[PDB]
Design a protein around this nucleic acid. Structure first.
Lengths: 142, 141, 129
RNA sequence: UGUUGCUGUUAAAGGGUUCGUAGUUGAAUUGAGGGCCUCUAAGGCGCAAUGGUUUAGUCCCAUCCACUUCGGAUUGGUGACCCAUGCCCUUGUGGUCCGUGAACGACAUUCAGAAACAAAAAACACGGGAGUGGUACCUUUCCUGAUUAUCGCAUGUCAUGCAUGCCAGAGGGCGCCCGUGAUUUUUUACUGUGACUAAAAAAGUGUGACCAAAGCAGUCAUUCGACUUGAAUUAGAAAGCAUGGGAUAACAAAGGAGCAGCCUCUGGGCCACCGUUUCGGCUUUUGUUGGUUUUAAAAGUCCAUUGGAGAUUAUGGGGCAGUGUGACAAGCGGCUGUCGCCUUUGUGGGAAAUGCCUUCCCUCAACUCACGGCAUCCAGGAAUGAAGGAGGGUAGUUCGGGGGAGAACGUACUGGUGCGUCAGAGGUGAAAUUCUUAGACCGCACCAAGACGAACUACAGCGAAGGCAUUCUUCAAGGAUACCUUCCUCAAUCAAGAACCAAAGUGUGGGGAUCGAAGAUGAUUAGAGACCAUUGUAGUCCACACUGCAAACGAUGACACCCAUGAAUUGGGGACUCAGCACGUUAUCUGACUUCUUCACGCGAAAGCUUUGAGGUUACAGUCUCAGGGGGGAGUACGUUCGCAAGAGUGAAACUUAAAGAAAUUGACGGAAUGGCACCACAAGACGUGGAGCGUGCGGUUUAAUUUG
RNA sequence: GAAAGUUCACCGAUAUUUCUUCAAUAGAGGAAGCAAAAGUCGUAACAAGGUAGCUGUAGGUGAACCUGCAGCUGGAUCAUUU
């Protein structure tokens, strides 16, 4: 339980300081190993250079093929996978094009039917990829 | 609760509800006093002085028929012991255990008991050097 | 042992009241326990009580009229103040209408209602409905 | 993340146990006062009076007599009691007043609180200062005397002295500063109030920037300005500041003979006072400074008795002596074991007075009772209490598979020896491994060696836990109970630290019967050191060292309080020969273990839990401590401490996944159980098919298609 | 009066070298974790799962595991000489 004494204070304090290390919602904030691990440095986005297009399978209950992109990160020289999140826009990504990369949804667990991938490609060459998809802009090769 | 180890007992001695002396005790303060000091010269502790008195002379309590109890009497006449009753007894029991254990080092029980008795004596010691009744350099050994 | 006299008394009263019993025994007595009872007997929640003398420590005995619903104890005796009457009165009581918190002051032992009136806060003591 | 307000029996989570320091928490006492008057203010389990035919009653009585469950009868009967006012006792409200516990003098003082005293008071009283108080402040009693300032008189005049004096005494009353005195002054948290504290920001008051976020502005007459123009106010952690309050707490001291002032009138005697080193310091007045010295107060000290107290009896206790009283056994006596000593001798009783006094019996325990001398010795009884809080004592040869030591006892297992018999024996589902004419198995007798102590042995006991079972002896303990003994808060729980700890393991020595990991052999099987069978090493046992790893479980931490139903058990207590004993029954109590398979309330998701809690918890707070934060990854890795080693303590992350888990229910299944039912099941048994030669269907292959279900 | 310069003391940049501490980092090979598949070998657990199960410990085995020893019931038993 707990201590109700007048001078009990210090025991209470030290108890909390111990038991917050059993919380993962404390660690995720205060500890900088988490920051380091994250490929953006904990920044909102980052840019990368497209390496290779990689076809990626899917898990057992929903059989599909998914289009993914092996990208390298300018900032930290790490490699990462990301998903193309529109229909038939694999075309609009080509090798050695700069590209932006974002997280998607829950960022501690991988998204369903794509293992290991929490990362979706928002922008190709700073153009909105959505804009290309539902036609407004056209991709520069300029 | 028992201080060390298990035990709950209610074995105890009460008090009289009459704190004034009986009608069949016509003895004065002085006679009581004299009796105490007389007995004490045999080396009897206060615990057995009270027993001798109550049983023979019908004394209700020493405190009821004199203005003071057994140690206060002794102190005032300079017969009082310098080692309190409760302390002395434990030390006797202690030493006797240590005899038995000197011979028998396979004895599990009396070993554990000696550990108890030790720390109990220490508690007493500590007490009586806060509330001065022993020298402040006293130690069990 | 018991580290609060009040706690020993008012867990006999509460239990007894939930069984509807019309008298209760109380093992110790203090100057404090008296005052607490006195309050509630004025406001109409207790018939009478006796203090009996063993010439060591007394044994209180109380007559319940069944008009109580709880008698609690606020154990650490936390500090309540002129603004903070409000706080306590909301949080530990089911009402502001008939909730009675009892407090200690230099002045004596009294209800929160009378405490406010004389404009002195103090350390809390116990409570009843 | 649960301080307010979390959970830990089974879902993530009580440490194997105990001791124990820091730390946290800790029982009760000191005690918060009263009266008289008014008030329909209430109650009355107080009460004089007087009221009431049954206009209301019950006990007694009357008449019946009714064997026993009818009644009525009147004035019944200060009876009982019922509906009434004061007399009441409390208490409500109302006023003021108290030396506000008891105590002291009471009109001429001290007057209804004052001198003294009690109590309170250092915010005080004890002495004193002109450099104190805008030129030394105010005042009333008692006498002296009255300036009635006819700005005059006196002091003073070389004066810018064109400047003061204009109340003796009495107690004083404030203000100011300093000196002295306290038996042990005194603080703090908390609270109320008040000080002291930048703006911006926030809360907020006013205001129509057209509204609005905003701003601190503006608004009005009506002119050669007015509003005294507005621009309020509050909060703002601790910590520091001042001053009330004095309940609850904390700090510190005391720890009880480890102590402790009686006050006071007056008189005398002596006496420096600081200080003690080769001469130092020193209080006014005498005109003053310089010198010495005296007288005198003060203080100290000695004696003296003047008045008054005391919180513990000084005409007293303690100890010696004389006389008489009561009395034991020998020496003596009764004239029947016991009585007395020149009686009586137990105690109230008896007598006699107006419960008491006196007389009379005439106060026993080897000294007890009564009286007297005077001789002694010499402070001592003034303390809160003794917690169903802790420690200690004593007792029942108390209580128990509690612990250590020493000595015997019991059969069995195994082996050996002797006396006999003769062919198989071991062992299993069936076998085989295994043992036998060199006589096994078997029977009896005896001996050796090692382990163990059956049945009795339990919804029993003891131990801190782990654990503990033949008998006798022996050593030191532990719990329970009983007590009008002792101590007086010494306690509760726990980081740190210390001790104990099942089995298997490790070191060294002894032992080695039985069983037995490893190993060996035979089966079983598709495969089988398997499970099974025959063997067999370590080990199993003991001593001395380590290890501390268990489902070490009640998966339930420790201490404390409250909490109901019934029947038992285990200990203690209560109502000649180990012997004023032991058992049992009835009833009661304290201490242990548990059952209601009629456990009360309540709690819980349910299973369940119930004075023996998981209950008294959203109406959430008795106290302390340890552990847990979805499931895996992991008790892994790294570091580090312990260990001979095996291992023990401490203890992550990367990455991955959306469930894991708890309980109950309904279905289904079981080489689970029980009761039943079927020639599509089987028993007994009659007839076939199943491999030939044919017909038909299907499969395969074939082919233009060999249609297809 | 006073400059260049001299000697000594003090403050001490920086370089060099060593040590300490923190951060990040390559690596043959070995060993785990996780995630896939329509691979392979067995049948251990759940029914008495066909050798009741599990915990601690030691040994053995190709695997799941098996075996001895002491416990627990979360057993297949709340229970059979008053």
């Amino acid at each position: 339980t707990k201590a109700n004494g007048q001078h009990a204070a210090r025991k209470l304090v030290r108890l909390r300081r111990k038991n917050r290390w059993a919380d993962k919602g404390w660690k995720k904030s205060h500890t900088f190993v988490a920051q380091k691990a994250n490929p953006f440095g904990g920044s909102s986005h980052a840019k990368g250079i497209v390496l290779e297009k990689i076809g990626v399978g899917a898990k057992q209950p929903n059989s599909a093929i998914r289009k993914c992109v092996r990208v390298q990160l300018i900032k930290n020289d790490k490699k990462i996978i990301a998903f193309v999140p529109n229909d038939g826009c694999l075309h609009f990504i080509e090798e050695n094009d700069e590209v932006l990369v974002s997280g998607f949804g829950r960022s501690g667990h991988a998204v369903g039917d794509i293992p290991g991938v929490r990362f979706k490609i928002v922008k190709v060459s700073n153009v909105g990829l959505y804009a290309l998809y539902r036609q407004k802009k056209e991709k520069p090769r300029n | 609760v028992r201080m060390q180890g298990v035990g709950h007992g209610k074995s105890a001695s009460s008090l009289p509800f009459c704190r004034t002396p009986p009608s069949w005790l016509k003895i004065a303060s002085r006679d009581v006093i004299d009796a105490v000091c007389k007995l004490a010269k045999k080396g009897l502790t206060p615990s057995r002085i009270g027993m001798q008195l109550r049983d023979s002379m019908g004394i209700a309590q020493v405190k009821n028929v004199t203005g003071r109890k057994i140690l206060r009497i002794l102190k005032h006449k300079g017969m009082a012991p310098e080692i309190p009753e409760d302390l002395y007894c434990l030390i006797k029991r202690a030493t006797e255990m240590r005899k038995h254990l000197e011979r028998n080092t396979k004895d599990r029980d009396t070993k554990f008991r000696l550990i108890l008795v030790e720390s109990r004596i220490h508690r007493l010691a500590r007490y009586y050097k806060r509330v001065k009744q022993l020298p402040p350099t006293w130690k069990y050994e | 042992t018991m580290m609060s006299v009040l706690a020993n008394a008012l867990r006999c009263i509460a239990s007894a009241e939930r069984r509807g019993k019309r008298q209760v025994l109380i093992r110790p007595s203090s100057k404090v326990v008296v005052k607490f009872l006195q309050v509630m007997q004025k406001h109409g929640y207790i018939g009478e009580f006796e203090i009996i003398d063993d010439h060591r420590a007394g044994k209180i005995v109380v007559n319940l009229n069944g008009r109580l619903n709880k008698c609690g104890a606020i154990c650490p005796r936390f500090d309540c103040t002129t603004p903070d009457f409000e706080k306590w009165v909301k949080n530990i009581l089911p009402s502001r209408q008939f909730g009675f918190v009892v407090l200690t002051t230099s002045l004596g032992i009294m209800d929160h209602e009378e405490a406010r009136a004389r404009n002195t806060g103090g350390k809390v003591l116990g409570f009843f409905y």
